[PDB]
myoglobin (Physeter catodon), 154 residues
Amino acid sequence: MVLSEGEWQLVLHVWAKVEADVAGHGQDILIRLFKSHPETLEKFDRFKHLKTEAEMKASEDLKKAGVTVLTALGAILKKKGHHEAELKPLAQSHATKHKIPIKYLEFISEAIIHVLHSRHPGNFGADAQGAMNKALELFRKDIAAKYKELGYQG
Ligand code: HEM
């Protein structure tokens, strides 16, 4: 799949807003993920013990993890499709080391869209949400293809 320059512009315009507060968006997104799909929390030996949202919001480790996910995702989106180099180390660690199924990437995609919609209603109308969904599907499709080459595809 290929996004048009117009769609990339919609994605990068809302992402520029996200970058004004990377730690806050990262936290919101990971908490949204863990509450919506608690099974994903088990994949993290660092957060596994966190029982409530209050505990998640107070976790300094969780806030740092959020910055890490968003920064890597941001580097990918800014490539506007030419992200093969960035995808390789990412696909290997998630497939071989952490064993994260594609299903879980759809869950986090859903959390990202939910949070952008909550925090940026003015810059995240239907067209911009369609563009972001298209960008994340591109991401998932390429990651799934690498999973298969690495011998996992989960
Ligand atoms: C947009 C999505 C994602 C991005 C860009 C991303 C990025 C990263 C990065 C950059 C790291 C650091 C080093 C490494 O490669 O291991 C990492 C670690 C990890 N990721 Fe993700 N990840 C994503 C989604 C997920 C999902 C959905 C899960 C789990 C449900 C997950 C679980 C893990 C785990 C278990 C680790 C290591 C935690 C630790 O021991 O510090 N990731 N991820």
In short: The first helix runs from residue 5 to 18. Helices lie at 5-18, 22-36, 53-58, 60-77, 84-97, 102-119, 126-150.
